[PDB]
């Protein structure tokens with residue numbers, strides 16, 4: 156019963172609680188206790204980006220950064236699993252403490268900064284996985300790589316993951332790598348999208364398959380910036396858009412412990428803004444490429460609000476932490 | 491632990507559940523026996539409509555339509571309690587069943603039609619109460635009164651309750667009395683507000699007491715309709731507006747048990763719409779009179795979203811049913 160579990164894990168700091176949880180998931184994979192995490196959910200098959208998703212709910216990136224627990228997380232009923240963000244070379248990310256709970260807000264603040272073991276290790280992990288649903292692989296820039304040359308890092312990762320990903324997610328929305336978010340503005344975006352599409356075309360000829368690419372944007376775009384991002388994704392024929400990542404906003408969590416910690420805010424205090432961004436983006440895209448909606452989804456009605464705003468699929472991170480596997484069941488069953 | 495209480499209570503049909511709980515509250519309200527439900531909450535004083543509310547959270551109209559349980563409900567920690575709706579003469583409401591639960595959506599559908607015992611009886615209950623918060627008295631039109639002469643039903647009630655109310659709430663937004671929502675449109679509205687306001691100054695010199703009046707609107711108004719209502723409230727110098735009552739919409743609840751029942755929807759599937767109405771209303775009023783926000787509030791963050799859209803105070807009903815007394819403590823403590 157999850158609230159009991161939650162009380163226990165919440166005695167630990169958020170990063171220690173994840174390390175504890177993932178150590179158990181890594182220990183039960185392929186044992187009669189991959190059943191202690193198994194959850195039967197109804198099938199709600201959905202076509203998106205040319206893929207067939209088991210159901211419309213995915214696990215957002217950032218929980219399994221290295222793809223070590225694909226099978227056990229898939230057993231919980233997700234229609235798809237997004238691993239990463241991963242970078243070309245390993246790096247440690249920002250100093251701990253870099254992750255904080257806002258329990259009364261059912262929100263989180265993270266400044267992880269892409270702590271990961273690099274793309275080559277993720278591929279080895281993916282090779283060993285058995286999951287049948289859709290696998291997202293989310294990639295990003297190494298901290299040291301200069302922002303103007305960001306595209307090189309995305310292109311390196313694509314080459315190593317094309318044979319293994321169901322779809323590739325491009326992360327240019329983390330607030331935790333300096334200047335990374337400038338890649339979603341103007342000619343930087345157009346240059347990045349051009350490089351990436353051309354690689355997709357080259358890699359299609361080498362592997363004889365088309366692997367869709369979705370771009371993951373920030374909820375802190377202005378109305379004009381969002382119109383420009385939408386136009387740029389259409390003109391470059393990007394396969395999808397993941398809306399949204401975490402927010403610099405703090406206006407709903409004033410006066411709450413940790414609200415002043417720098418980083419991206421997620422969970423319930425992001426829900427409304429996420430939904431407003433999806434609805435404005437859907438008007439701009441007008442059906443031309445699909446939206447994956449993420450941001451503070453913590454209930455069936457919240458998932459349904461994002462569908463109404465224009466998304467074809469939804470993802471959760473924070474609501475999984477605060478409501479647990481029951482939320483997967485709720486959403487898949489009634490979305 | 492309310493989620494276990496709720497499991498049991500949700501074994502009874504909704505109205506039986508209500509009557510069983512209120513039968514219990516009736517036998518303890520205004521006695522030492524109310525230690526059983528008393529909750530200690532911090533003081534968060536807010537000045538609104540010329541009154542001091544001991545905290546920003548009200549019980550919306552509904553739960554106690556006859557004013558039977560003011561002290562008991564006050565002891566759970568509400569900063570204000572709104573009783574009613576009440577009409578001049580008693581009336582039984584519509585035929586049962588008239589109250590339906592949508593558990594997975596955490597919303598309710600109701601077509602009660604103002605089942606109450608009449609204003610004379612409510613005044614006698616109010617006389618016996620000792621609540622130290624603000625008491626609101628919501629008043630409505632008898633089912634038989636022609637909407638043309640609706641104003642007479644409101645003026646009757648005002649005379650009988652003025653000496654006892656903290657503020658008076660004019661319900662012209664229930665969808666359960668035919669024609670009533672027309673009283674918020676164009677010329678009907680201007681006439682009612684003229685009559686109600688004239689009566690208010692009348693009663694102020696008779697009783698030497700300042701009693702603000704607020705109008706409760708529907709969430710299903712068009713932009714042009716909302717602009718007109720707001721303009722009309724300002725021109726007649728109404729003291730505040732309560733946004734919003736229940737909705738005729740069903741977009742978010744398709745495919746759920748009871749989604750096709752006629753009546754007003756409340757709880758989580760009204761939350762987004764209610765907030766958007768408040769935001770748009772606030773834009774119009776430009777601070778010229780305060781908003782009491784209500785509609786699907788079920789968490790401290792949702793309460794704060796309504797504050798950020800412009801509300802000065804908030805009320806709960808459906809969230810009270812679905813999360814219980816602890817929602818009171820969350821909201822008063824962290825709003």
Ligand SMILES: Cc1cc2nc3c(=O)[nH]c(=O)nc-3n(C[C@H](O)[C@H](O)[C@H](O)COP(=O)(O)O)c2cc1C
Nearest residue numbers: 215216217239240265400421422450451471472473
């Ligand atoms: C601790 C943490 C780490 C995250 N890491 C990543 C990441 O590496 N890549 C990415 O694209 N998003 C990452 N995210 C963002 C989530 O994928 C998600 O988009 C965001 O938290 C909003 O969704 P939510 O409100 O359901 O949590 C991370 C989020 C958190 C809370």
Ligand SMILES: Cc1cc2nc3c(=O)[nH]c(=O)nc-3n(C[C@H](O)[C@H](O)[C@H](O)COP(=O)(O)O)c2cc1C
Nearest residue numbers: 550551552574575600735756757785786806807808
């Ligand atoms: C069963 C029920 C009875 C209600 N009775 C009244 C009423 O008598 N007068 C009134 O103004 N609103 C009444 N309401 C509406 C609530 O006061 C509230 O405005 C609406 O339910 C939205 O808030 P909520 O989603 O938190 O419940 C009633 C609502 C329900 C569910």
Ligand SMILES: O=C(O)c1cc(=O)[nH]c(=O)[nH]1
Nearest residue numbers: 267268269329331401419
């Ligand atoms: O790893 C991170 O810091 C990170 C990445 C991302 O996309 N979003 C976020 O909030 N944090």
Ligand SMILES: O=C(O)c1cc(=O)[nH]c(=O)[nH]1
Nearest residue numbers: 602603604664666736754
């Ligand atoms: O009691 C009712 O019928 C009623 C009144 C009101 O204002 N709103 C509502 O949804 N129901």
